[PDB]
Every structure is written in structure tokens, then in C-alpha cells.
Structure 1
Amino acid sequence: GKLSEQLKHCNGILKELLSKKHAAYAWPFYKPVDASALGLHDYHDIIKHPMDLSTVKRKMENRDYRDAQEFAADVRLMFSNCYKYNPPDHDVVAMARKLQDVFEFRYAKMPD
């Protein structure tokens, strides 16, 4: 019940974050940052634990997450990495803030 039900809620949130509804600001978070491709040669010196929605999806599909807290920690790690690496006035930070608003408001509706 509880753990399964809470992970169903997490899976629902994940599907929404990946949905066309949010694509305009979610797209930078779909796949791992390709630091080399973008010439971001300091990315892996600054970000020690990269995270993205494809990694969260793989972990959910593999039943890696044992509870909602573990799932939420990865989603927030993804946003934190964005806030750590990028100047706060960058468009990717505006997109991060918007997708995190979607995440936090629906995560708060967790079944007890």
C-alpha cells in the first residue's frame, strides 16, 4: 500500500514532467548534460553527481527507488546542479525554477 502508492504518485509526477504539457521548459532536463558537446569543460569539476529525468526514469523502471523521499532527492539534485553550475539569470535557471514549481506543488499532494 503506502510505499507502492507513494511511488505510484512519484511515477505520475515523473510522467507529467516528461509530458508535452511542460516540454517548453522541461527539455533541458530530459537527458544528461553532455558537457563535452556544449564545451562545458568545468561541468564535471563543479557537479560531482549529475542527474536528469532519463536517469530518474531508468531508476523508477528498475525499481531502484525504495520510497518517495529517494525519488524526490534525485529530482531536487537535478535542479540543485542547475542552480549550482549556471548564473542565476541564465534561461536554463528560469526553466529549472518553472519545472521545480510543477514538481514541488504536485509532490506536496503525496498520499499519506
Structure 2
Amino acid sequence: KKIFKPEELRQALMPTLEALYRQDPESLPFRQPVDPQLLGIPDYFDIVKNPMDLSTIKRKLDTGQYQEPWQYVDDVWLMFNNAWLYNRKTSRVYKFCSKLAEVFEQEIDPVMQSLG
């Protein structure tokens, strides 16, 4: 397997993470972990067993917790898939999720090609 240095993953993938953060208001529900107590949604962790958010992805990238870049891709789609699972199709959070996913799909392709 190709060996990836944590510093190469960080420098290569951080621009793609910024592309999600800079969407405002679209990124606002995703910047911090879902807090079901605050949001009044007691069933959240009955439905979402593996939560993920931008701050967790960013910390993992900054601290070298990804061994290979598709694990970063996995966490981003887990974030989005959790939100599409939990929220109604008509809800603002669901629509903002789809907006971020389109940005991600555009940005991630050339970066992954360059890491190969």
C-alpha cells in the first residue's frame, strides 16, 4: 500500500475542508457535533450511531489520525449520510447537506488524483 505521511494529507486535504466551512449558512449545522440535548431531539443517537462533523474531521486531519486519504473521504460522507438519514427531505439542514455534498464532490476529485 502507498504510505501517506500525515503532513502530506493535512496540506493536501485542508483546502477541501475549507471549501465546506466557508459556505455560510450552509455549513453552520455541521461545524460542531450534533448536541441532542440542546436541540431537543432525544432519539438522535438511536438513529445516528456513528456521529461525525466538521470539527471532528478537522481535528483528525490536524493531528494525523488518517492513515490514508480515503478515510477522510469516508468521514465526510458519513457526516452527510448521517444528516440525510436523520432530517426530513424538506428541512433546511437536509438541503444544506446536499449543497455541501455538491461542493465536496467537485473539490475532492483533483485532490485525490494528486495524492495517488
**Same-fold call, TM > 0.5?**
yes
Query: What's 1:9 paired with?
Result: 12
Partner AA of 2:79 in structure 1: M
Percent identity between matched residues is 36
Q: How does 1:13-24 map to 2 (within 5 A)?
A: 13-19=16-22, 22-24=23-25
Unpaired stretches in structure 1, ≥5 consecutive residues: none
Cα distance in 1 for partners of 2:66, 2:17 equals 13
Q: Contact (CA 8 Å) 2:32, 2:54: kept in 1 or not?
A: yes
Q: Kindly state the Cα deviation for residue 99 of structure 1 after the two structures are TM-superposed.
A: 0.6
Unpaired stretches in structure 2, ≥5 consecutive residues: none
Q: Kindly state the Cα deviation for residue 7 of structure 1 after the two structures are TM-superposed.
A: 4.6
Cα distance in 2 for partners of 1:17, 1:87 equals 21
Cα distance in 2 for partners of 1:57, 1:33 equals 15
Query: What's 2:57 paired with?
Result: 56
Query: What's 1:45 paired with?
Result: 46
CA deviation vs aligned residue, 1:31-68 (integer Å, no higher than 9, x gap):
00111111100000000000000000111111001121
Aligned residue pairs total 110
Query: Secondary structure of the residue that 1:109 maps to in structure 2?
Result: helix
Query: Secondary structure of the residue that 2:60 maps to in structure 1?
Result: helix
Query: Secondary structure of the residue that 1:3 maps to in structure 2?
Result: coil
Partner AA of 1:28 in structure 2: P
Query: Secondary structure of the residue that 1:23 maps to in structure 2?
Result: coil
Q: TM-score, normalised by structure 1?
A: 0.89
Q: TM-score, normalised by structure 2?
A: 0.86
Cα distance in 1 for partners of 2:11, 2:70 equals 13
Cα distance in 1 for partners of 2:35, 2:93 equals 14
